[PDB]
Design a protein around this ligand. Structure first.
Ligand code: HEM
Ligand SMILES: Clc1ccc(CO[C@H](Cc2c[nH]cn2)c2ccc(Cl)cc2Cl)cc1
Length: 398
């Protein structure tokens, strides 16, 4: 592949500036499964010398289906942390369902599914609709400002808060904790600890369960979450459903600003197909990883026991062999077999429909209250080597 020497698809330095679209496309053409070597002290907390970069949609899907071979437990699924992270701080992330394997995963996913039935998510619809409309109304009123803060941030948080029945009086502190919890190495957030906020939120979660969806989860059925499991559940959601859906909203609106015909069409018909195009295009989670528990031949590459594989959803979502005109934003996209919510398999995003609803509700409200919104200045990107984040985006709502 024509890539610079020692180029690392997980390098936070890249994502601080841009998405490496041209580099991904190069791999898809020249080396769709490619060993991304990492020098010592530069593996983002991993010290195994590198990982297999997975760039093709079907390979991402194959990995995600074969979780009997490709493990989330062994090194967790987050492929990049601060280079100096202690291993202990990686391993502790095995206490969330995301970073478990069968049979422990199966049991927790089965219980936590109580929270995510279409009926449970459907019940949140009206309050989130009301919240979305008021958010949009308040941003329109303010004239201009930070679209991330004023429009993208709060609804995903309210969706988490509503699913859990957090009292309104407690939502402020909950959101504060949640917003310090998804680790990054960005200089704007250098003074934030993850650790303290996580401890403090698990403390609240376990007090909440003590005082008591929360009911369904901690009530015996005789499967129930233990109080610490409920805590681990809440801490997981604070990361899983926060900056993920936020960046779908930010970058979907960015897509609309760049594709004014799509925005015009959206405002008329709010089509059913928009949310999934927004997710495909935003690809909030750039990459998650797995560790091979045995040797596995994947598209002619001999993957070895113990090696990491990094599924770059940002590549797979633009796979030219699958998506017609992948680099066209098409809100009527059909079909749309994207992996923005993961490959289908044991770990496929449990919050996918909760995210779609959040997305439709906010964009309906934006179309309603700020139909002529225009950016004032460039998005500011988050320094993360797995999260595709926009910290700030100054826009003129009128
Ligand atoms: C547009 C927004 C979202 C995106 C792009 C996204 C992305 C993903 C992806 C790629 C995975 C796969 C995990 C893996 O295969 O290793 C996942 C899993 C997960 N997501 Fe989402 N997600 C979003 C919204 C949400 C929301 C709103 C929630 C809940 C409030 C949620 C909860 C979860 C949970 C609990 C898992 C782990 C499932 C398991 O391990 O069994 N997600 N998400
Ligand atoms: Cl007191 C606590 C509570 C919870 C965890 C679980 O550890 C990490 C973050 C993390 C914090 N401190 C060290 N590591 C974590 C991983 C994945 C997700 Cl999706 C969410 C979270 Cl919060 C650890 C300690």
């Amino acid at each position: 592949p024509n890539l610079p020497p020692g180029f690392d698809f997980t390098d936070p330095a890249i994502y601080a500036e841009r998405l490496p679209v041209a580099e991904f496309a190069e791999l898809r053409s020249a080396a769709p499964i490619w060993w991304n070597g990492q020098d010592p002290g530069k593996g983002g907390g991993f010290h195994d010398g590198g990982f297999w970069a997975i760039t093709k949609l079907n390979d991402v899907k194959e990995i995600s289906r074969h979780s009997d071979v490709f493990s989330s437990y062994e090194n967790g699924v987050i492929p990049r942390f601060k280079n100096d992270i202690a291993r202990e701080d990686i391993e502790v992330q095995r206490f969330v369902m995301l970073n478990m394997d069968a049979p422990h995963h199966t049991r927790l996913r089965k219980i936590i599914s109580r929270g995510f039935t279409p009926r449970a998510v459907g019940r949140l619809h009206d309050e989130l609709q009301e919240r979305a409309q008021k958010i949009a109304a308040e941003a329109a009123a303010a004239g201009s400002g930070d679209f991330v803060e004023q429009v993208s941030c709060e609804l995903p948080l309210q969706a988490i808060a509503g699913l859990l029945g957090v009292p309104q009086e407690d939502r402020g502190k909950l959101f504060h904790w949640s917003n310090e919890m998804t680790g990054n190495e960005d200089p704007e957030y250098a003074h934030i600890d993850p650790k303290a906020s996580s401890a403090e939120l698990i403390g609240y979660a376990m007090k909440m369960a003590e005082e008591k969806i929360v009911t369904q989860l901690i009530q015996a059925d005789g499967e129930k979450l233990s109080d610490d499991e409920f805590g681990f559940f809440v801490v997981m959601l604070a990361v899983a459903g926060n900056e993920t859906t936020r960046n779908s909203i930010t970058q979907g609106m960015m897509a609309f600003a760049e594709h004014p015909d799509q925005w015009e069409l959206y405002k008329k018909v709010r089509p059913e197909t928009a949310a999934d195009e927004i997710v495909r295009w935003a690809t909030p989670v750039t990459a998650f990883q797995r560790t091979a528990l045995r040797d596995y031949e994947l598209s002619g590459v001999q993957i070895k026991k113990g090696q990491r594989v990094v599924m770059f959803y940002r590549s797979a979502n633009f796979d030219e062999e699958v998506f017609q005109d992948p680099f066209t934003f098409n809100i009527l996209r059909n079909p749309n077999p994207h992996v923005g919510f993961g490959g289908t398999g044991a770990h496929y995003c449990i919050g996918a429909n909760l995210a779609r609803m959040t997305i439709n509700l906010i964009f309906n409200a934006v179309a309603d209250h700020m139909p002529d919104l225009k950016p004032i200045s460039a998005p500011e990107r988050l320094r993360s080597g797995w999260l595709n984040g926009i910290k700030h985006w100054q826009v003129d709502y009128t």
